Design an enzyme around this catalytic site. Sequence first.
Site, PDB file in Angstrom:
ATOM      1  N   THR A  84      44.463  40.294  30.070  1.00 33.49           N
ATOM      2  CA  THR A  84      44.351  39.570  28.841  1.00 33.49           C
ATOM      3  C   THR A  84      45.083  40.047  27.674  1.00 33.49           C
ATOM      4  OG1 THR A  84      42.368  38.660  29.847  1.00 33.49           O
ATOM      5  CG2 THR A  84      42.972  37.808  27.710  1.00 33.49           C
ATOM      6  N   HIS A 123      36.941  33.789  40.985  1.00 37.88           N
ATOM      7  CA  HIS A 123      37.340  32.763  40.028  1.00 37.88           C
ATOM      8  C   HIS A 123      37.312  31.396  40.748  1.00 37.88           C
ATOM      9  CE1 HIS A 123      40.165  35.886  37.840  1.00 37.88           C
ATOM     10  NE2 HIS A 123      38.876  36.247  37.834  1.00 37.88           N
ATOM     11  N   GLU A 139      39.458  39.043  22.690  1.00 34.12           N
ATOM     12  CA  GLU A 139      38.919  38.992  23.972  1.00 34.12           C
ATOM     13  C   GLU A 139      37.531  39.536  24.205  1.00 34.12           C
ATOM     14  OE1 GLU A 139      40.451  40.936  27.322  1.00 34.12           O
ATOM     15  OE2 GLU A 139      39.760  39.411  28.752  1.00 34.12           O
ATOM     16  N   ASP A 150      36.838  35.692  28.740  1.00 33.29           N
ATOM     17  CA  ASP A 150      37.363  35.760  30.110  1.00 33.29           C
ATOM     18  C   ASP A 150      36.342  35.194  31.108  1.00 33.29           C
ATOM     19  OD1 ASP A 150      38.509  36.736  32.683  1.00 33.29           O
ATOM     20  OD2 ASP A 150      39.920  37.689  31.286  1.00 33.29           O
ATOM     21  N   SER A 153      43.633  36.452  36.043  1.00 33.65           N
ATOM     22  CA  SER A 153      43.643  36.549  34.588  1.00 33.65           C
ATOM     23  C   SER A 153      45.046  36.753  34.034  1.00 33.65           C
ATOM     24  CB  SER A 153      42.771  37.772  34.184  1.00 33.65           C
ATOM     25  OG  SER A 153      41.420  37.545  34.456  1.00 33.65           O
ATOM     26  N   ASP A 173      33.878  37.880  32.415  1.00 28.67           N
ATOM     27  CA  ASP A 173      34.474  37.762  33.747  1.00 28.67           C
ATOM     28  C   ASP A 173      34.028  38.948  34.582  1.00 28.67           C
ATOM     29  OD1 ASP A 173      37.306  36.926  35.295  1.00 28.67           O
ATOM     30  OD2 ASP A 173      37.058  39.114  35.179  1.00 28.67           O
ATOM     31  N   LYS A 174      34.042  40.145  34.021  1.00 28.95           N
ATOM     32  CA  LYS A 174      33.763  41.374  34.789  1.00 28.95           C
ATOM     33  C   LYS A 174      32.356  41.412  35.321  1.00 28.95           C
ATOM     34  CE  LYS A 174      37.305  43.675  32.132  1.00 28.95           C
ATOM     35  NZ  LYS A 174      38.279  43.755  33.266  1.00 28.95           N
ATOM     36  N   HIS A 198      32.034  38.774  38.127  1.00 25.07           N
ATOM     37  CA  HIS A 198      32.456  39.287  39.465  1.00 25.07           C
ATOM     38  C   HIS A 198      31.358  40.173  40.052  1.00 25.07           C
ATOM     39  CE1 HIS A 198      36.607  38.230  39.699  1.00 25.07           C
ATOM     40  NE2 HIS A 198      36.924  38.704  38.502  1.00 25.07           N
ATOM     41  N   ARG A 256      50.279  43.319  37.319  1.00 25.05           N
ATOM     42  CA  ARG A 256      49.323  43.718  36.323  1.00 25.05           C
ATOM     43  C   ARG A 256      48.714  45.092  36.621  1.00 25.05           C
ATOM     44  NH1 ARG A 256      44.405  39.680  37.012  1.00 25.05           N
ATOM     45  NH2 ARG A 256      43.159  41.386  36.093  1.00 25.05           N
ATOM     46  N   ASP A 276      44.473  45.940  30.549  1.00 24.30           N
ATOM     47  CA  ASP A 276      43.985  44.817  31.359  1.00 24.30           C
ATOM     48  C   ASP A 276      44.768  43.543  31.086  1.00 24.30           C
ATOM     49  OD1 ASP A 276      42.287  43.756  33.440  1.00 24.30           O
ATOM     50  OD2 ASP A 276      40.731  43.264  31.948  1.00 24.30           O
ATOM     51  N   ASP A 294      40.269  31.825  30.158  1.00 29.78           N
ATOM     52  CA  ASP A 294      41.508  31.770  30.952  1.00 29.78           C
ATOM     53  C   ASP A 294      41.337  30.983  32.218  1.00 29.78           C
ATOM     54  OD1 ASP A 294      41.307  35.123  32.352  1.00 29.78           O
ATOM     55  OD2 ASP A 294      39.691  33.762  31.754  1.00 29.78           O
ATOM     56  N   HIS A 295      40.132  30.975  32.782  1.00 25.33           N
ATOM     57  CA  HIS A 295      39.849  30.272  34.005  1.00 25.33           C
ATOM     58  C   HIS A 295      38.305  30.194  34.189  1.00 25.33           C
ATOM     59  CE1 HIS A 295      38.787  34.281  35.324  1.00 25.33           C
ATOM     60  NE2 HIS A 295      40.012  34.631  34.980  1.00 25.33           N
TER      61      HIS A 295
HETATM   62 MG   LIG Z   1      40.431  39.620  30.525  1.00 25.76          MG
HETATM   63 ZN   LIG Z   2      40.313  36.235  33.640  1.00 28.73          ZN
HETATM   64 ZN   LIG Z   3      38.286  37.941  36.974  1.00 31.55          ZN
END
Ligand SMILES: [Mg+2]
Ligand SMILES: [Zn+2]
Ligand SMILES: [Zn+2]
Lengths: 449, 449
Positions: free
Chosen positions: A155, A412, A322, A51, A102, A327-328, A331, A166, A153, A369-370
Amino acid sequence: TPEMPVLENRAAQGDITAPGGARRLTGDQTAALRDSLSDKPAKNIILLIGDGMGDSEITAARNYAEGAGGFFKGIDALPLTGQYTHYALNKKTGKPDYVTDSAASATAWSTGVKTYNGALGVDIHEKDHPTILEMAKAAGLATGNVSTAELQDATPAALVAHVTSRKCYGPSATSEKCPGNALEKGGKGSITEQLLNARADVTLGGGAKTFAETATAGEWQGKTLREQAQARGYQLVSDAASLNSVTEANQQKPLLGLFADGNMPVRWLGPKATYHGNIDKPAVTCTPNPQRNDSVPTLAQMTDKAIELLSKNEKGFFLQVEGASIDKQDHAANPCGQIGETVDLDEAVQRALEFAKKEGNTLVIVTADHAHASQIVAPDTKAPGLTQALNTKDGAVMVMSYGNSEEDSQEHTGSQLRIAAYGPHAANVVGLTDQTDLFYTMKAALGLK
Amino acid sequence: TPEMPVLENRAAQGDITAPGGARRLTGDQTAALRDSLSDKPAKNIILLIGDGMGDSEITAARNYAEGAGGFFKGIDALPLTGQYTHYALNKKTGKPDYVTDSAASATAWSTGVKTYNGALGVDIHEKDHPTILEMAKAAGLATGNVSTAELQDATPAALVAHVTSRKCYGPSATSEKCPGNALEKGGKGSITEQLLNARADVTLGGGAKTFAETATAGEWQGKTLREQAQARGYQLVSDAASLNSVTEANQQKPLLGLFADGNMPVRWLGPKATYHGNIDKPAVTCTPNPQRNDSVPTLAQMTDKAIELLSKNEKGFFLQVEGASIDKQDHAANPCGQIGETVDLDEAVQRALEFAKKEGNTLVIVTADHAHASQIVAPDTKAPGLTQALNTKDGAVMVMSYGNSEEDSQEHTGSQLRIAAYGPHAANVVGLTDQTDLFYTMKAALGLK
Ligand SMILES: [Mg+2]
Ligand SMILES: [Zn+2]
Ligand SMILES: [Zn+2]
Ligand SMILES: [Mg+2]
Ligand SMILES: [Zn+2]
Ligand SMILES: [Zn+2]
């Protein structure tokens, strides 16, 4: 017989300061690439998502952990590579929204339809579209769903649940944010209820917390989702020993691993990046997180057990894994947590390749994913955002910067990013492709209707 | 038939809001990939460099010009792609310096040896290494060097000069910043002087300014560098019609085109990004530069002209084309200029590909020397840096953020980035490689000793 080769070693071949020493190749790769191309069917598919693991994140992580001239034995060892686009849509206009979340992205590869940010398994008109997982299962294939995040989550949820938001983790949030999906309103239910209905053979992650919620309707009204899971025949495991104990996982006795209340613990600890952190503060050395645990399975261990369990199914299996926390931690502007999660993913990819190389009919795909915020900048940089200097494996300083938001969470980004694969049908990730192409690639590789 | 296919259509296939509508691929690409693979020797090589053209840059530009679901007919059309590393070295330690400048990176592809930021055609011990251009000449091949920056700028200079500092444009700066290279102190000379010695068949770009300088020593002492050039047989051109007039370019009558005093003009104009611009200011539509002139050749015309002339050479040719201003406008936080120079390069790529499709023995390469600062962020982003909202071809807003420098210059970043190729020996860019490998791939493709 490893018919299809993986790249054994693309580290710099010698002394980086001498002519040719920084080379990652040792000769012409034509024959090897030709050798990597097969349009034979795939019996299995292993999809590995980092992620927010764009090119910047992979680079940062390699520099830290392996050195600039090092090589991720998992991550970088895939021979067929390209870049893919992940833009989402504006729910209202149908036009592109250049920076996905996500949820939209995961919906993209898991259904083949673009969608708005925040959606899971529904298009812009809120219609449900079957996921690759539901399709695989319908076709008789074993199915796996593995993440280090809470299972609710975006994903892992995208493969099993179709909700308009989500945020609709369980009964409570669903009644309020997804009225249309609410059980008690005649809907399919919350993410967690749909996950229980979907019945993948193997599901392993965090998010046990939401399992304490009680259902508002249906056959199991008044009981907790954890209780419905048991009532439904799921084997519940909550630590690595129990997970290791499992010998069978199927539709009769599906596996549900809940290893944390929320997200699983991160691999590495470090302080958060700061304003002028690279100038004010000394360099950081990341350190293993003591709460990581022996009782807590790691990503590679989860991957390894799922493949064991799924590989017993004779028609083939579909498995998504995953690396959630890259990602977490991006951020949170925490370099250490971030790179530590990418290293964790690399270990999981290594297990997937060892299996596929042996099997010979397994397509393994590694992407994100991004894109995300982190940037690698010069050591003496004076940036408006948050920076941190880190001591790498090379014994040099690398600075990381996060300067895309003033708000608390780093954002992102929309850049096209690396997608890499190995095995039959891998050719279809080379060049520029879109994230929705990946759903079609998987369907086709598997021979699904 | 062009046995070697180019990607013709990688645009989204239909309505992006519908299933499969955003796909870029029409069917399985295995066969097509098999067909893009050949180990035959290359007769010619055309290397196209977008300065600072990282994946983010390509994405932003595609979004703006072609739309999210669009495709660059040049840039995106190359079938074999990978990601490569471009870290430099710290001069004292020999340890990696994670973020390179334009000189160290150009030196890496041009020579095959890693160097320090600011070095041209020399390693960390200040020793000279032969460049691909030098070697191709020695072998009898025709040679070309084209750019929209000042010809003394890092990118084009690296093929023809060996100086300890990229700042050593001419005699004056050289005597000051690169004494050891100073013609007087017995050195090879300033960048422009060495450019004159290297004697490429065709050299096209800006940088007339420095040529007004006068030589301090050697055979042409006291004469300006311009006189020295005409004096050494160069055919001088200063405009498009002059350029068009050329019917030949060779060692006998080499071509030198100086199309501007500094950098050639940028294609597109727009305001600079500002703090909270995506919020506080209206979305921007870029404007064509009224002053870019019909008298000034575009990168694509210089490109087309160089191929015609160099191609008259029966032994073959090596050609380098740089879209120099993507990077400079990235530094200036100017979305319009940056994107406009990417579109400009895409037209040059198309020209290279067209020739290559037909010729059949041409290896064409498209990459960048390093990554840059620009990021694509969410429209409502509140960033600590510089931002701008733009109106794209999709008729939606795209936001661009430059947030890695508080100074008046936005900096380079160290992420790995796309490298793409078409033709003989193109497999060599697939997977992860290092910028140094590019030197080795080109030398081996051509068979230079
Ligand atoms: Mg994820
Ligand atoms: Zn993501
Ligand atoms: Zn994110
Ligand atoms: Mg340049
Ligand atoms: Zn540059
Ligand atoms: Zn630059």
